[PDB]
Symmetry: D2
Subunit: 343 residues, 4 copies
């Protein structure tokens, strides 16, 4: 017997938000760095960690030139950044919505170790998620993000890790879709270790298959979700070298065997890659001569803002220059969304 | 760790056969009627059941005019019909391969009752399937067929029935793909009972999701398989009337949420429908304004040959007339494969 | 490959605690009533809800006569009651440990609705459970409790509800066993509705089988856990009347088909039963002529303290009389643990 | 909703047969050796393989002295041996039933390779099993046997192998229990390789847990089945030496964590062990100071008849001497069923 989890109006608004995010040529900026990760990033540049420094850095990211308006369709924020205001007086959700963006929020509470496994982790943050999601929906957040970690090792990932992460992702997506918030499912597979394209493709297919089976078990409206996978790439210690066409073929082949075409868009990770090779690989993925029935776009945390963070230096007078670097990367990644990129 | 079930040459030949079957404009004739079903069909026309009568009827089906050559890309046969010869001297696999067809064979051994359930059945025929598939591959069979039965009732289908049928279908597809034979997965959902489009769509999504999860568990090469579903249609005793656009929208929506686009083609059933409404519904399915990244074609047992069986009458001198009726339906269904059909 | 979740010393201390709790003749008092439930219970007696009233009621429960010392081996407390002190100066964990009890704590955060189902709920409270369990282990808590709710209806419980509750219970038990705390798994099946013994036994067997499969998937040390099921009883609106021997036979039969004998003890619920019929049914369960290879004891919330709450009346001078009623029930339930009870 | 797979009379007769087989002091002789295995065994002794030689060897096994009457409660036969007659005129089922035995039959059709795995096999023989089981029930067979093979390796057994073997075993047990035949579930784990007690215990617990979950999914009457596991023993190439008490503790510990006490009996394998060490290990298992709520007995193929096959030599005049050796082993194993054995 069928009891509908969503009314057709809820399905319509979720599909409308999900189509607005991964619109052709647009992508996602991931400004969701928590205090420890952004503390390490501000320590690398050599500045102290203060609320004013983080607010100024996200001012540099969010208040850029108007040329990024058909570049960034969605912005993932922290919980703190939702309640911070710009110096003009507008709060950051209004700054995002003023120039055509969609406000997001990273809603997980970190990783917990799984007992009995070889360093496998699950994700935390399911308690109070309905009240928090209603509160973020009142504050302008229209989509969310949840990050699961899986690593390739000797016998890892086991069935327990993939099963638990798929169940937690489906529970998260159900709770988010009850409150009118488009969930972004992110089964990140770590590129650590030494493993070729074939094993990474195998693990990607198994993890994505268990994820979509768990999404089918929990009555998830697949047209109002987004997928956030990592590109099928060799490990860091792998000695064999692969062309970008082989990486793109492995990624599109691992995606086409699992992902149903009702899913609205696919937003790739950077995943420890360089700033230029991520756009090169995304341009190669969008140039693969297969039939890809979804949006292939970017959700880059480091690969959008690393050059801007370097050219900033913690000094205010460098601002525009740093912003210009960011704008450059955004423009490049927009062409990487369309297959029209060339370096 | 990954141990490949198939070498790249096996993947290439399976993809080549699967692309040859569901080629644009082509479809599947299902002449696989066993002795009991074809005995009831010959009793309805009023002729005795003899080997010569069945051989003559399949002569009428297989030796038709050359206008069905870009209509029928594959023909499913019985075990007996593989070893029967035409009166010209050519055996029926050579008659099929001479005009551009692909020879198939129905390989299951019927249905067995599942204990503890409410009239739910599983499918039989896994023993000796590797030797039988190698023998049929020597005799010209390049694809196979396996039929699972699921009915919608009060609390049926249960989890046990869908789990068992998906596991048996995946085991069948693994055994067939080991021998170079493209498997056709057929999870038929019975249209008996009174149930609307929404419950049939719900059961279709759940059954197809469990089927493709079991196919992912058994390392099936999804590019070298075919899918044989039933159209999402209301029950026989359902009082509500639905347009063909609503049936087509429900079918394409139930397919797009589950089926990954690596699957080469989708061959629909007739499923107790009339001869004209099946082609009308297939033309409506191919005219749906959604993005459908696979081949939508027909595999019609009764809806191709019912008019030919009626116009035959068991008399030899009627032959061409009966054949002409069959040719008409084939031509119509070819346009139903392309969306260019109109009655 | 096997990576041990627990060292042998952790297994030894968990088995020692679990053997100390369900020792022969001993049982569990469930004083874990939260502020809403105990607010309804104090409203039924006609007293206001204050911290002093709840502290005095749990003083009446915990500081009773020394005749309950071979009666109660474990006491489940609230989070608040761990930090409340008696008027003598001893905190309530020290009052429990002074006379031979084991301190427990109810650690879940309530129930959340499951989307798409017919009124089915999952349980909340997984975030921060490792830090909370280490904190409670520092404060004297040696076991925990987690309550999942499942109801029998038209098509409920579905596979989604039992799967999600079993996975959440196994995750809870893993997190508790990492910190040296014996988990008590409670899959409560609601007695609401009209259903006979056979359907309640069927649902109990299916739920307990999925629970123990999920416990096997998560590497749970089964010798250091406890099981908290409900007695297999007909519904509230069921018209058929059953003897206590039939209820006991259905309970022992549903337990013997699922529960492996490595589980240390089984602590039954009251489950909305009367004060005397719970002890009668437990005496019947311990008098069943089958081989029961675990501890059959009680964990009664209402069926231990209802008469004491009634004879208290909110007046201090009634105290001993109220306590005497409680002591009576405790003594009776101790005989209900041993099969030597008679009314 | 519950539809009973078995009436109470069917449950009563299955429980009666299952209690008659594993009666205290009794065990199972496995004379089910097929023509290839018994051909290798007769080639080792140096005699030709003929129907008369196999009939005479099973005459030596089945027509022994009356001292084996409270030793052997059940005998597993081949399909051929059911229809062979003794020289006195009685067919072999009547020879078994005359002195208090129960006639069994090995009903599987061998092992099939699983594609994509590292040398993992599934079991064959599900087709026609209802008609074959009704035929064997007419011919005096009251129980059956089915053998699944699982090996421990680098990453084997995978989830696919254990899932498929558990599903096939549950389907087999359902089909056998529909026809009034007690199924004997045998998940044999191969002792090949080099692995300690801990990994063999881990694999035994995982395999038995998935087996009993699949038995719960298929509505199997657990009181009318038998379990046929292998003893938890180190590998053949394992360098570490273990006492018989450690092997017995590992076996009873792996059994107590999984097997519910509704299962009537546990019949251990020999599993490539010597003739005396199997009885020594079974005596150690029955002397373990844990609570074991089922029958612990033997089902020995080679460890009962190896000395009789050696002392036979293919010569008729040696008969009684060979039979005497067999009787000795049977007597020893009867004491190994009771814990009263000493060498």
């Amino acid at each position: 017997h069928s009891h509908p989890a969503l009314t057709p109006e809820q399905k319509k608004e979720l599909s409308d938000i999900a189509h607005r995010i991964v619109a052709p040529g647009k992508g996602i900026l991931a400004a969701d760095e928590s205090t420890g990760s952004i503390a390490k990033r501000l320590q690398s540049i050599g500045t102290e960690n203060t609320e004013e420094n983080r607010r100024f850095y996200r001012q540099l990211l969010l208040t850029a030139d108007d040329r990024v308006n058909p570049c960034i369709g969605g912005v993932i924020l922290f919980h703190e950044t939702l309640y911070q205001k710009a110096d003009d007086g507008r709060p950051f959700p209004q700054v995002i919505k003023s120039k055509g963006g969609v406000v997001g929020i990273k809603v997980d509470k970190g990783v917990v170790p799984l007992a009995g496994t070889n360093g496998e982790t699950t994700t935390q943050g399911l308690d109070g998620l309905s009240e928090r999601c209603a509160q973020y929906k009142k504050d302008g957040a229209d989509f969310a993000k949840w990050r699961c970690v899986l690593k390739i090792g000797e016998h890892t990932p086991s069935a327990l890790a993939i099963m638990e992460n798929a169940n937690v992702l489906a529970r998260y997506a159900s709770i988010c879709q009850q409150n009118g918030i488009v969930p972004i499912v992110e089964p990140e597979i770590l590129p650590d270790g030494d493993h070729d394209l074939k094993r990474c493709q195998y693990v990607t297919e198994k993890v994505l298959a268990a994820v979509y089976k768990a999404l089918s078990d929990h009555h998830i409206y697949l047209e109002g979700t987004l997928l956030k996978p990592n590109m099928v790439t060799p490990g860091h210690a792998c000695t064999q070298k692969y062309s970008h066409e082989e990486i793109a073929m492995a990624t599109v082949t691992a995606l086409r065997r699992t992902v149903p075409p009702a899913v609205t868009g696919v937003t790739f990770l950077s995943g420890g890659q360089s700033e230029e090779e991520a756009s090169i690989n995304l341009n190669a993925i969008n140039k693969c001569p297969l039939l890809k029935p979804w949006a292939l776009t970017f959700s880059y945390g480091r690969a959008l803002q690393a050059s801007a963070l370097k050219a900033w230096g913690g000094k205010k007078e460098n601002l525009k220059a740093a912003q210009e670097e960011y704008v450059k990367r955004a423009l490049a990644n927009s062409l990487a969304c369309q297959g029209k990129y060339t370096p």
